[PDB]
Amino acid sequence: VDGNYSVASNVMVPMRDGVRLAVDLYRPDADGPVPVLLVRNPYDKFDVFKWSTQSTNWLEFVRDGYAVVIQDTRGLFASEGEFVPHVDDEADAEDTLSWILEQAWCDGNVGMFGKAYLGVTQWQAAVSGVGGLKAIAPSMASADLYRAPWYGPGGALSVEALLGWSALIGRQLITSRSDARPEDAADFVQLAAILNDVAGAASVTPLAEQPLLGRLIPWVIDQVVDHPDNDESWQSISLFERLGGLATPALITAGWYDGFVGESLRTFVAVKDNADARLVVGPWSHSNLTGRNADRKFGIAATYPIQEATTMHKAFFDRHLRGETDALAGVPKVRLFVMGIDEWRDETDWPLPDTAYTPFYLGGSGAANTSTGGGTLSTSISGTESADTYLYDPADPVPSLGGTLLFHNGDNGPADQRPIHDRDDVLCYSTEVLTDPVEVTGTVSARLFVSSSAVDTDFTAKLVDVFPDGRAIALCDGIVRMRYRETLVNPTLIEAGEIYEVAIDMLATSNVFLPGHRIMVQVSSSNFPKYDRNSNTGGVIAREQLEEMCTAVNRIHRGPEHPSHIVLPIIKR
């Protein structure tokens, strides 16, 4: 009977090392083998409601004759072994795909889908070289775990991401225990205390001293906190350099305020030339897919469109797993939610073909400190050589507000920035009020001429849409940790007082700045706890006591000889 299926629970699948991973099998009631979809999940295969609303109505796949396999990753829930994030998923996926292809009900075509960690596991499957894997659909995910979600292209630790995710894993571990331990109740209460105040949890120094999280999951320190450089421990789990050699179609989803957005987009660029890649980018954060935020509404069309996503995935799998050559007719290559006009729009490529990478130069009379300073943005080079100066004190960092936060207030991406506009360490530069719309859609970076009294420090840049009513809405932002200014791999310190030209990777955005709005940039030296705070010492930042840290007098240089600017991807239509 078409539309009918059965579900077998806890089918144990043996890995190469003998450890068995548990899967559930959703198999259509049909004669003959069927195409198969695999989901590798660290959050309990049984608990399909926890993630499915952020993905697809995938039971439609099963009713339409796909088999679906959902697997507990190694060491979690019904699976045997020991859980350490990322390090076993390449081999475990290869073995799992091999097992699936052997089964009587598999017709030789496997795909995957899933979000975040369930999207990472698809890139880790895709590098296995198993021919039966015909397509993947990694949503809001990354193929380079240093660059997202644990560190970033700027070389700063995403501390709220680390601590928030570790705490959720700890609670998961405790809730899943066969026999409760005497300390479970208290551990559970204190993991909730981390999740209720992630910035406070991230404020304890030394950062590397994590008595609770380091005990429940030592990888927190042993891998992430102890490896601030993009070293072999990170490269060993990175998939990115191998993506260019694949020929695997990929349906890639991202969100403009999602923690993985920079790496999600880079996977699309890395695979688009060798197979059928697809891009969908909505205005979502990792945990807020509604399109509604405290001070910014994108309209109901911005709500994660799960039914259209289901239709698109099925069309995608029909083309690549069933060989239905016309299945993707009418489906665009790229589909972006363009903010400002707040509309979905089809494109033929990402980056957009006619992108004009345009410098907007920092300038203005007087000091650019606070939103009532003199800072300007202009497409013309500033005529007068000036400099803006502020004190970055690690004990008083600029609080994170919106952006791509994951667990610390991570449901308000397009956050109003006015609560930090008064800060002397927040330099503001903006255009005049616009009389014509300006569309900025693409990757965004800054090039700043900076100097410090310290031998290391951070510099941040944040792009902002100023509304007529005064709302200053965050778009995209980035950081550069000065020791990593040239390389994330082999850092060197800087000379106090010397001027450096540094790039700040500000990820990406799609926004039409409408008439009556302004384009604004904030520059500073902290963004906490989105990023951990630089100690301004050149030390091992995560091993320093707050007392051991130094303040830094930092300076942005701007003028004809130091033309600091933000590079905006301008689209004109």
Side-chain angles (χ1 to χ4, degrees):
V1 195
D2 302 345
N4 291 7
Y5 61 96
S6 73
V7 177
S9 302
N10 284 337
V11 177
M12 305 308 289
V13 179
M15 305 289 93
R16 68 191 52 182
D17 67 344
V19 172
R20 297 188 311 167
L21 263 41
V23 310
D24 297 347
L25 301 183
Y26 300 72
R27 292 178 284 178
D29 283 342
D31 296 302
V34 298
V36 180
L37 301 174
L38 169 67
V39 174
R40 307 200 66 250
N41 179 7
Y43 312 117
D44 196 354
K45 55 174 177 53
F46 281 152
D47 188 6
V48 296
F49 302 144
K50 185 145 72 29
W51 59 270
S52 296
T53 48
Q54 285 68 254
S55 181
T56 46
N57 295 321
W58 52 266
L59 292 169
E60 223 162 282
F61 306 153
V62 182
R63 291 175 207 118
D64 194 50
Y66 287 87
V68 167
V69 181
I70 309 173
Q71 181 177 69
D72 287 320
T73 52
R74 175 179 290 254
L76 301 167
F77 294 98
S79 277
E80 296 169 7
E82 308 306 322
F83 170 73
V84 184
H86 309 320
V87 302
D88 296 299
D89 291 301
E90 279 189 43
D92 286 356
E94 184 180 356
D95 298 345
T96 298
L97 294 167
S98 303
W99 180 86
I100 289 176
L101 290 161
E102 303 194 347
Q103 299 312 292
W105 41 266
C106 176
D107 78 353
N109 305 269
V110 186
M112 307 180 66
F113 62 102
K115 177 180 192 277
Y117 198 107
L118 294 66
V120 171
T121 52
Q122 292 173 71
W123 293 118
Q124 296 173 293
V127 292
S128 78
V130 173
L133 185 59
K134 303 299 167 132
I136 59 169
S139 178
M140 299 180 254
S142 166
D144 185 306
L145 287 314
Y146 185 95
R147 296 174 60 102
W150 305 127
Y151 278 83
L157 172 71
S158 306
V159 59
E160 64 91 21
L162 181 60
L163 299 188
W165 188 76
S166 300
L168 290 160
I169 295 292
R171 301 185 104 229
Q172 191 176 264
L173 300 171
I174 291 169
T175 300
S176 81
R177 279 201 218 285
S178 327
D179 312 293
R181 303 176 176 182
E183 65 281 20
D184 282 349
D187 284 356
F188 202 77
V189 169
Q190 213 205 331
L191 293 163
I194 297 176
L195 288 164
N196 285 330
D197 178 16
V198 175
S203 292
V204 304
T205 59
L207 207 33
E209 278 179 22
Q210 299 291 327
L212 172 61
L213 295 173
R215 162 172 58 89
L216 294 184
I217 163 170
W219 160 100
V220 175
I221 308 306
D222 298 347
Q223 177 53 55
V224 190
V225 168
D226 282 344
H227 292 263
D229 308 333
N230 188 20
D231 60 24
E232 289 69 31
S233 73
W234 289 111
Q235 321 289 23
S236 149
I237 57 172
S238 175
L239 307 316
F240 191 77
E241 290 304 303
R242 287 177 275 172
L243 292 200
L246 298 182
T248 297
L251 203 180
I252 295 147
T253 305
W256 300 121
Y257 299 95
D258 177 80
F260 303 84
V261 61
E263 293 306 299
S264 301
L265 295 165
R266 286 202 330 146
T267 64
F268 174 84
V269 171
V271 300
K272 63 177 184 188
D273 295 314
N274 295 136
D276 174 38
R278 302 290 167 146
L279 183 58
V280 176
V281 186
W284 314 299
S285 67
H286 162 273
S287 69
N288 173 2
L289 276 69
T290 68
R292 298 181 49 88
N293 299 271
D295 297 279
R296 184 69 167 85
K297 264 65 192 183
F298 296 115
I300 72 167
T303 300
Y304 180 81
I306 184 164
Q307 297 183 123
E308 306 183 30
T310 303
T311 297
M312 187 188 173
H313 281 71
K314 176 138 72 52
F316 187 76
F317 294 139
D318 283 351
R319 164 84 190 89
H320 301 293
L321 279 69
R322 298 181 141 157
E324 294 184 13
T325 44
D326 293 346
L328 289 172
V331 185
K333 208 75 179 161
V334 173
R335 185 149 167 92
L336 307 182
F337 190 84
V338 180
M339 303 179 288
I341 56 177
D342 289 346
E343 288 169 21
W344 287 102
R345 193 179 72 201
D346 296 350
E347 305 284 344
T348 57
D349 211 353
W350 175 275
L352 274 53
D354 292 325
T355 298
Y357 294 97
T358 306
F360 279 61
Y361 297 96
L362 283 53
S365 315
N369 310 61
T370 84
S371 58
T372 57
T376 62
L377 288 176
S378 173
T379 56
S380 294
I381 295 176
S382 301
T384 298
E385 203 69 56
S386 334
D388 301 301
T389 304
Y390 58 90
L391 184 58
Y392 162 51
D393 180 351
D396 184 18
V398 179
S400 303
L401 216 41
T404 61
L405 288 158
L406 284 171
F407 304 110
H408 175 76
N409 297 322
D411 57 350
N412 190 26
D416 190 356
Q417 300 299 297
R418 277 178 298 186
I420 64 174
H421 275 1
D422 67 292
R423 285 182 57 107
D424 191 72
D425 58 351
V426 179
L427 314 178
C428 301
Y429 312 83
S430 50
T431 65
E432 81 263 59
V433 180
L434 305 177
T435 74
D436 298 297
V438 178
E439 172 166 348
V440 175
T441 297
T443 52
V444 180
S445 67
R447 286 241 155 201
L448 306 181
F449 295 78
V450 310
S451 58
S452 178
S453 69
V455 301
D456 187 38
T457 196
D458 292 345
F459 289 98
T460 59
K462 181 190 315 213
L463 180 65
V464 176
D465 183 343
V466 186
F467 277 64
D469 68 11
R471 276 175 302 158
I473 300 302
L475 292 159
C476 52
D477 72 271
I479 188 158
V480 63
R481 181 144 294 165
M482 284 305 282
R483 71 183 65 186
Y484 303 110
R485 69 197 172 284
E486 280 169 37
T487 167
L488 304 168
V489 187
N490 303 120
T492 64
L493 303 178
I494 55 157
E495 299 298 306
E498 175 173 337
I499 296 175
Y500 296 83
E501 178 177 8
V502 301
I504 298 171
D505 186 339
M506 302 165 65
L507 304 192
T509 201
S510 187
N511 190 56
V512 184
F513 299 80
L514 288 171
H517 292 235
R518 298 176 184 255
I519 305 172
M520 185 185 206
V521 183
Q522 315 175 354
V523 179
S524 192
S525 288
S526 46
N527 176 10
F528 175 88
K530 169 64 198 177
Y531 298 114
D532 79 326
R533 50 201 168 160
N534 205 312
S535 56
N536 297 324
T537 62
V540 180
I541 293 164
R543 291 290 177 176
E544 287 170 281
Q545 304 148 197
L546 178 56
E547 286 323 319
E548 310 185 286
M549 309 185 176
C550 296
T551 68
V553 176
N554 293 338
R555 187 170 286 164
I556 305 316
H557 302 264
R558 46 170 173 103
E561 292 311 285
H562 304 99
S564 295
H565 60 278
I566 180 174
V567 181
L568 295 178
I570 296 295
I571 300 293
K572 178 118 73 161
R573 295 178 182 171

